[PDB]
Design a protein around this ligand. Sequence first.
Ligand SMILES: Nc1ncnc2c1ncn2[C@@H]1O[C@H](COP(=O)(O)OP(=O)(O)OP(=O)(O)O)[C@@H](O)[C@H]1O
Ligand SMILES: Nc1ncnc2c1ncn2[C@@H]1O[C@H](COP(=O)(O)OP(=O)(O)OP(=O)(O)O)[C@@H](O)[C@H]1O
Ligand SMILES: Nc1ncnc2c1ncn2[C@@H]1O[C@H](COP(=O)(O)OP(=O)(O)OP(=O)(O)O)[C@@H](O)[C@H]1O
Lengths: 321, 370, 298, 17
Amino acid sequence: AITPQEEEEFRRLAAKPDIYETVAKSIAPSIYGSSDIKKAIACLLFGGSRKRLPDGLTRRGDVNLLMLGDPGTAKSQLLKFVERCSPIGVYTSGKGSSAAGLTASVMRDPVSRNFIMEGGAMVLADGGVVCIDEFDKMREDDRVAIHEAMEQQTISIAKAGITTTLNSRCSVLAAANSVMPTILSRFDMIFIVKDEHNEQRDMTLAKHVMNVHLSARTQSSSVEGEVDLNTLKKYIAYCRAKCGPRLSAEAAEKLKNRYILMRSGAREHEREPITVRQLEAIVRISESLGKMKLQPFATETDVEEALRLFQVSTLDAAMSG
Amino acid sequence: EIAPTFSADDVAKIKKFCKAHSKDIFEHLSKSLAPSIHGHEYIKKAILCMLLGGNEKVLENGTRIRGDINVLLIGDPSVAKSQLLRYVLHTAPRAIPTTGRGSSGVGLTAAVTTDQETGERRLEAGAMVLADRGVVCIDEFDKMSDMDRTAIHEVMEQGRVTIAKAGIQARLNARCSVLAAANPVYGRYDQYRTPMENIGLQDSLLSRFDLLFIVLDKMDADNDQEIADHVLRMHRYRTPGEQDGYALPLGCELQIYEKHDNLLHGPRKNKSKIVSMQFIRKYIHVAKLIKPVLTSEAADYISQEYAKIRNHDQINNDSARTMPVTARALETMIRLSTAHAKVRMSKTIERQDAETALELVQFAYFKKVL
Amino acid sequence: ELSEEELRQITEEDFYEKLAASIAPEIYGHEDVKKALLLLLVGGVDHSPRGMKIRGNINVCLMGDPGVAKSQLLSYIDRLAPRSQYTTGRALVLADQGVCCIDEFDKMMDSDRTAIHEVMEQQTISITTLNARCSILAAANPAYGRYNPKKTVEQNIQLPAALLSRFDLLWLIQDKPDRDNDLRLAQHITYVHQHSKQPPSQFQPMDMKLMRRYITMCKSKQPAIPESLADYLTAAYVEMRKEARTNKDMTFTSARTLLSILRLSTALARLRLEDVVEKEDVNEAMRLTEMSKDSLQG
Amino acid sequence: SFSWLEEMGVEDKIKKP
Ligand SMILES: Nc1ncnc2c1ncn2[C@@H]1O[C@H](COP(=O)(O)OP(=O)(O)OP(=O)(O)O)[C@@H](O)[C@H]1O
Ligand SMILES: Nc1ncnc2c1ncn2[C@@H]1O[C@H](COP(=O)(O)OP(=O)(O)OP(=O)(O)O)[C@@H](O)[C@H]1O
Ligand SMILES: Nc1ncnc2c1ncn2[C@@H]1O[C@H](COP(=O)(O)OP(=O)(O)OP(=O)(O)O)[C@@H](O)[C@H]1O
């Protein structure tokens, strides 16, 4: 249910060259700082492009994040905000009420003796986002379910004779305090959210918190330069349902050259690593940017930005550890 | 299910394919088995042989010789081991995927479970029992409980899981082919350590399997360039008839070859042809139906080659050896020869089948051709 | 049952070796092992002199390198036996008056090994006692991948020494890379897979049903040991104990050795359809024991 | 065509149209 006026508004908004930074700022206005994390969340929200080959195998187009860091960095608020901006979403907190279900279950209603086949939260969030908090506290059964869903994207139910396989194609955004290793390997971008003691940053953060507490009465005050949540929802839905981009030949050449150089340098350093999986992750990030700008081809600048994001998140996480 | 009906034109096409490719048909099928994955020629050949299978000989006294081939793949991550499992699951009929850990409390084998609401005990069948006369694509073989290992011993040896606990004395048929993959425990595969050390398991389980391929991640610049080029070509593909910029909806006559697309197949001067999936399935079915019979020449050649192989294994073995050469290699060679005879559509095994079986076995054990 | 014509057909001398070879003709070699399996299947003779219960059940253990057709022999014995249950290391009551085939015997639990000790000493399970008159056939593999003659029996196959000593006969099968033997084995296996039957031999293999009939007929007889032959038993056992005290490295010829010798001799006389144990039975039992001893030595 | 299937003893167990 979108009027032509809203479609015209979306076209005008996407036509701007600064749409990427605007979307980055629009995410979580209350939380101060962490621009790179906001950009990564934007990339996750817009998502990659799904493909199908003649053999019948389908390459997935989802992007998965993971936020590790010290407590008190407002991960939960960010996850809740993300859950309210995707067209489809769900919030499950680890080990709390078994983190919702996360597993398709077959219970038996005792009075009626019938068998009911509720799907897990992942099934309910097909084609959307699944925000998980306290990832390390997950129950073992839900850990198995997560391991299965992130690999094959098909949740299977085999209990009490009933044997079916459901479908779950969701982008997983999880946050944990500290370090299962296989699942951490499945994730595309791993952000280690550290802390800084810049006096200006600390003073600004303290002032912002104090001002929020002071203006609790003045909560009606608005923000400028951002996008309303409903507008963001509609824009995300429209971009997802209209434009699926692809790489260009020059971008492919640049990415291949960068990958070859990176692998040669990594091998030389080990003599004193990046694998194809991370190359595909970079491809999906580039496609997500291209889809965000409503274009049928991703240029070289998208590849450069994806490389920068990957270097900031995954390479830095590997180096720090 | 889906019945694979055949017509006269289908049989004519199959006969023409056999005649025009009286030789190197095995090579064409292996190459066309999975085009997206680059390299891994011998692994694809072994997978094709597993799909075709062997022959079961039931002797007069009643002893039965199993006719299924088992393959196991150990190596570094990000080398497309699971993609081969998915392709096998998508191609072969009656394929049941598992996670290695097991199906809830049932496990890979069968077990007796109680309802805990009325207390009644029911016998729930594991994945191995369900996929009788089929293919089981076990993934992450290392993540397995001890009881599962002990049961798998007997299931893979006899082929008949025996349950007598809880007063229910029964035997179930579990004659299944097992294709399994695993990852190293130390993050990266140590070549010097034995396969049982790297995978973190016993050695008799390694003895059960027929073939053991070790796939190592190589950092040669040329290999990385070729793999990156292939991946990018696959990731820039657009199906014909789609307007550029279109996005998938995500709703909620037999052809010998496929139309040549330079992005997917690659412009090898238009010298490469890939057989379509439907033709592969029908040909595999027809090959499954046949039952060849061995000849004297094949027996003599296999015996002499087995003697030479065991002599060569007694000497050398200075570097890391995947497996010792026991007497099970003879059974493996016979099964592979029957599989190749099936794929060639002949009804009598000859010397060439034994030669191909010898090449596969030597590559599987010595890791080097001849 | 049986007929007199079958009695004539199997009453010819050396039919002991004929029945031995008739067991699992597909397996190439291991003749003495097949004879031991036949003795286990027939079993010894129970006796109650002055109320002293003396069981006749025979227990055989197969040890050595993996992949030498242990499971083939186990399965064939399980199928040929009138009553038997096949089980892995990880039941006994159901095996009463039969044969209990236990594969992968080294992967058991010592808690159940205490009960196995009880059964091997008492043939009962005391929880009310349930009869456990089952002869146990066990197969084990080394825990280091291969058997080392340097290491002892306990070291190579981690298992308590006493439980190993309980078994009447212990067999060690080692795989040797001999070119000629490998060639013969390859020809044998190719022939089996080609003609769907074993290669021709000197004696026609017996059928399973006739084998069961003759096993039951032999089970009918209950021979006893005369005291006149027992003097030769004294000479044999004193010589055996002298050899044991010559080199104490191996298992001693304890009283269990003599009891097993008596049981084997009685079973051999039982197969010969005789009611009196003779010199030939003692000679054959000594030959089997010495063959097992040499198999243990490396 | 179907004769060739009978040649290898396979036509008896092939789903004809
Ligand atoms: N810009 C900010 N940076 C850090 N903390 C902030 C910021 N703005 C607000 N906060 C406050 O920081 C606290 C963090 O809350 P939250 O539970 O979301 O994060 P957390 O302690 O990192 O989470 P968890 O314990 O679940 O890992 C809250 O009290 C929130 O109000
Ligand atoms: N020739 C190739 N060699 C290696 N990887 C390839 C090749 N062609 C494609 N790939 C890609 O490499 C990735 C590896 O896939 P996958 O996740 O199955 O890896 P794996 O390490 O074998 O799996 P597992 O996690 O089950 O051990 C996939 O994205 C696949 O498409
Ligand atoms: N006389 C023989 N000597 C050696 N091998 C033989 C002989 N006859 C047959 N074989 C072959 O040996 C193999 C027997 O394997 P089997 O599973 O019985 O081994 P096993 O030693 O009982 O196993 P494990 O001890 O490892 O559990 C078969 O391939 C069979 O064809």
